[PDB]
Design a binder for these strands. Structure first.
Lengths: 84, 208, 99, 100
RNA sequence: UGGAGAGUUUGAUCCUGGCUCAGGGUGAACGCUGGCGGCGUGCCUAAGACAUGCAAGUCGUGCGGGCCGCGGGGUUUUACUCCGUGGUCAGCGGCGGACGGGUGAGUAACGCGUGGGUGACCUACCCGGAAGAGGGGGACAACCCGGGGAAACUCGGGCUAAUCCCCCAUGUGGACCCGCCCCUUGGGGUGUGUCCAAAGGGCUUUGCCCGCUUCCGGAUGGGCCCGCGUCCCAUCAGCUAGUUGGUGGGGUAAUGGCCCACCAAGGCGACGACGGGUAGCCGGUCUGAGAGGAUGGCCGGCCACAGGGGCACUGAGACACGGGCCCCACUCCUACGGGAGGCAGCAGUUAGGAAUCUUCCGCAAUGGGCGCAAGCCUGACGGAGCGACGCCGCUUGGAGGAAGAAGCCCUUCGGGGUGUAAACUCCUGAACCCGGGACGAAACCCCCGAGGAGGGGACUGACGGUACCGGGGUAAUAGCGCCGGCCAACUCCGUGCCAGCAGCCGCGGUAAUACGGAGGGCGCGAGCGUUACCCGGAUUCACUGGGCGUAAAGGGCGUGUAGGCGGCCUGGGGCGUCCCAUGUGAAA
């Protein structure tokens, strides 16, 4: 199965995650498929909100799953939201 | 670590003096005037034929001596000159002087380069806001480099203020005697602010 | 010292028991089929065929001759059965057999 | 994009199986000039519709057998010989190199 | 937007031509010196051995239990049975243990890189959609009795369970066979005859949830194959009997001789087979004018392996690091009857070696396991530690201060040099106390709305009272190499082919700018040099970029096989060749 999740690429104490689709079985800091996000839980510069709205929506459609703080960042990205 | 010691012993080593120790190394001697010519035993024997490369090398030394730094970082940033495009050595001299210590110098804040390094490193000099340490901190076209809150309350600060007046700024270093500040501007060159070292020689020697 | 791969071991042993026994059953039934077939009488070989194919998708049912090999051996069985039938025999009794 | 090769059929030697003498051009990723080299693939001819020399077009196929890959499809031109002829001569001259 | 050379064979010159150096680079190591910090990186040799510690579990929304315990339910009570019920531990049971992780031994291979084929295939774990959950019945644990063993733990009869094992039914659909239909390598619809299903839990309980059975589709992964690219020895020239091919079967998920039967003799090679030597390939990295040369730690992709070799079972997935069996080798345990272990997982130990780390902290983040969740495991991972080990940042002070002290070296004894250097004068404030002080974390969870989309409510820090901010405040480690040409830096003693130096030329045979020492200078600066190792220079394997009259070098001449390479007109073809449009060339 496939999962969407957070992969760090920051310095020895400079965290910074990317939100990306990968078939779970792949390792943390490894290859993926669709570069569909990034986000920094430290709020470096006001750009810490990145999710590929379209194909993330369509990804959760095709039968994919997210992670924890991924649910968080999508309940902020609103890709979850239908607007109501 | 900036040699430290017999400094204007190089004021004579290069041959011609430089604004080095400040008031004195500009007063009736940078150790010059009195007797300018390289020290040592062979002090004045009968100057030989400096191989062409060595004229070049002595120029490199010369320039990095006036600029007050070891040639390590100097090397790295000369490479940064090669990379950051422009007629290499020119925009090199520029992106050399853009360094905060001597920005503080020619801005008329510090009397001498060493003194400058002290002042800046102790955050006596602030840069567009935060009291930036690091003598090696290049600024940008627009930034206003000031001093510290406890500097208007500092001494040889007011010395510098009063005794400097009647001296015009490096045409981009827009100071303040009114508030002790100073805007950064355009990139100066060989002629905006000149000095006694032929740049082409320096670059040609360096990258060999 | 210990683990849960002792549990995995013993389990694997039971699963192997059922697997082995059933697969063997399939093999023998098939052999019966060819016996009465190269003979030349459909009848009992039709009974054998029913039993066989059922056990075949009993193999597909779980972790034995999964999907193909089950079906593949259905094919090959009925095939090798059928050919020898019309050879000295009237292919009758519509069982696991079309026409 | 099932790769297909245009080549001179060599030796009907086997039944339902033909050897095919392909030859490709190439540059020289160091010296510029062009080069050329022959490759013998496994033409699948289940009814000997091919024979001595006749160039046919061969196909990237299901693994027909042991190295026996590369079926056929469209026959091209017959009455070739001459080519297969020269190749043959070269073969005999391979058996013209001995240290024994 | 990037490219320089000099030393060196002669009495002397030009050309030729090797040895040398200037250079950048390193997981380095060695002697000399060595302060704070960031980020990094740190067994390259023994794929030798490894003691200890940890590293794979989890679920009671799968099912019967022994044992600590409470109401003590029955006991009119007893002695203690037993409805309920908080907690431990095994079992059957279900998913994980085929991910994660370490290593370069093998492997010159379709392994890898790479572009595709699969009308030849496999794919549990989450989304789509249709079809669905009739009944009966069986086995073995745990546990009951008895025994043997040092331990490893072991045998026999006896017990009840279930999403555990089954048989008939229910059959959209699926599978086979035989037949038609379009397709055209087994693609797809379809007719007759047989076979295949299903398992129940939890409650807020009459309705929802978690799991279910069947097929079609999605998602991703993966096997199979193919074109091309992928190192030296031709003093390795012939290689071969499953070998080459078929037809017919086994086996596989399927293709294929991978395997068997049988039958036909091909299969391959100087375009460099077969064989020996050597190495995991790579995105790239360092060098380089460029082409090229080397190489592949860390990081990422793909391989293959667990002390060496063979094997199979389980399972959607493996010949399975920390699962089993076997053989050999090896240590290790015991009362000697007989046994256990595999750290090329994390630390650490040991030998090898000139060389390379704490038997540490946190599950607070991310990612993985399983669970309705609560939750637990998590040496993946997140961090502190030790090494100047590399890049970078920084400090050992800043201002005036002498026709210039003292000391020390040179002298033609007038002085010159170290030297603004010093002491002092003031200014600051490395270090270091007092105080305050973090970001790194909003979800899952609780309620409003239904558990749906949306709102509020609430727990969550290892790092560390560290980064950081405020006040206060002390002048406070500087060394290494060079100084004959290359090459910036010279005088003085001692030494007298002795002592020595040395990268090449050479330097010492009693006036040495080379040896030691001393003054002074060059360079570099928490660095300095040495050796090693690769690329450069080296246009010294020359493709941009070379040569063979006498310098290295034209075959003793012919002959002609293959190959290479070809005059001039026309048009067709469009193969190389150029262009046009996209897929791809992941990230870094």
């Amino acid at each position: 199965m496939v999962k969407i999740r957070l992969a760090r690429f920051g310095s020895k104490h400079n965290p910074h995650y990317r939100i990306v689709v990968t078939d779970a079985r792949r390792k943390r800091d490894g290859k993926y498929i669709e570069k569909i996000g990034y986000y920094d839980p430290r709020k470096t510069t006001p750009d810490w909100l990145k999710v590929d709205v379209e194909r993330a929506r369509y990804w959760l459609s095709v039968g994919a799953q997210p992670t924890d703080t991924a649910r968080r960042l999508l309940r902020q990205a609103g890709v979850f939201r239908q607007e109501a | 670590g900036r040699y430290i010691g017999p400094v204007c012993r190089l004021c004579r080593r290069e041959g011609v003096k430089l604004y080095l120790k400040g008031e004195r190394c500009y007063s009736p001697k940078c150790a010059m005037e009195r007797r300018p010519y390289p020290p040592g035993q062979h002090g004045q024997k009968r100057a030989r034929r400096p191989s062409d490369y060595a004229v070049r090398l002595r120029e490199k030394q010369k320039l990095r001596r006036i600029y007050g730094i070891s040639e390590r970082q100097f090397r790295n940033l000369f490479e940064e000159a090669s990379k950051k495009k422009g007629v290499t050595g020119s925009v090199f001299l520029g992106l050399l002087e853009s360094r905060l210590d001597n920005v503080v110098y020619r801005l008329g804040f510090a009397v001498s380069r060493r003194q400058a390094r002290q002042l800046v490193r102790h955050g006596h000099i602030t840069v567009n806001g935060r009291r930036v340490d690091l003598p090696s901190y290049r600024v940008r076209p627009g930034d206003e480099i000031a001093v510290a809150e406890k500097s208007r309350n500092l001494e040889l600060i007011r010395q510098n203020l009063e005794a400097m007046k009647g001296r015009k700024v490096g045409p981009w270093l827009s100071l303040d005697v009114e508030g002790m500040k100073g805007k950064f501007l355009r990139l100066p060159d060989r002629e905006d602010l000149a000095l006694p070292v032929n740049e082409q020689l320096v670059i040609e020697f360096y990258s060999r | 010292r210990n683990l849960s791969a002792l549990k995995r071991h013993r389990q694997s042993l039971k699963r192997r028991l059922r697997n082995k026994a059933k697969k063997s059953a399939i093999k023998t039934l098939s052999k019966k089929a060819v016996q009465l077939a190269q003979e030349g009488k459909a009848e009992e070989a039709l009974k054998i065929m029913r039993k066989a194919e059922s056990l075949i998708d009993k193999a597909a049912k779980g972790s034995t001759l999964h999907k193909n090999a089950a079906a593949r051996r259905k094919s090959r069985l009925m095939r090798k059965v059928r050919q020898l039938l019309e050879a000295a025999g009237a292919p009758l009794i519509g069982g696991g057999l079309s026409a | 994009p099932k790769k297909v090769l245009t080549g001179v059929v060599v030796s009907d030697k086997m039944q339902k199986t033909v050897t095919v003498l392909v030859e490709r051009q190439f540059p020289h990723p160091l010296y510029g000039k062009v080069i050329k080299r022959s490759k013998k693939y496994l033409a699948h001819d289940p009814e000997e519709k091919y024979k001595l020399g006749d160039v046919v077009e061969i196909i990237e196929s299901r693994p027909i057998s042991k190295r026996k890959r590369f079926r056929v499809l469209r026959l091209v031109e017959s009455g070739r010989m001459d080519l297969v002829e020269k190749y043959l001569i070269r073969r005999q001259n391979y058996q013209s190199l001995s240290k024994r």
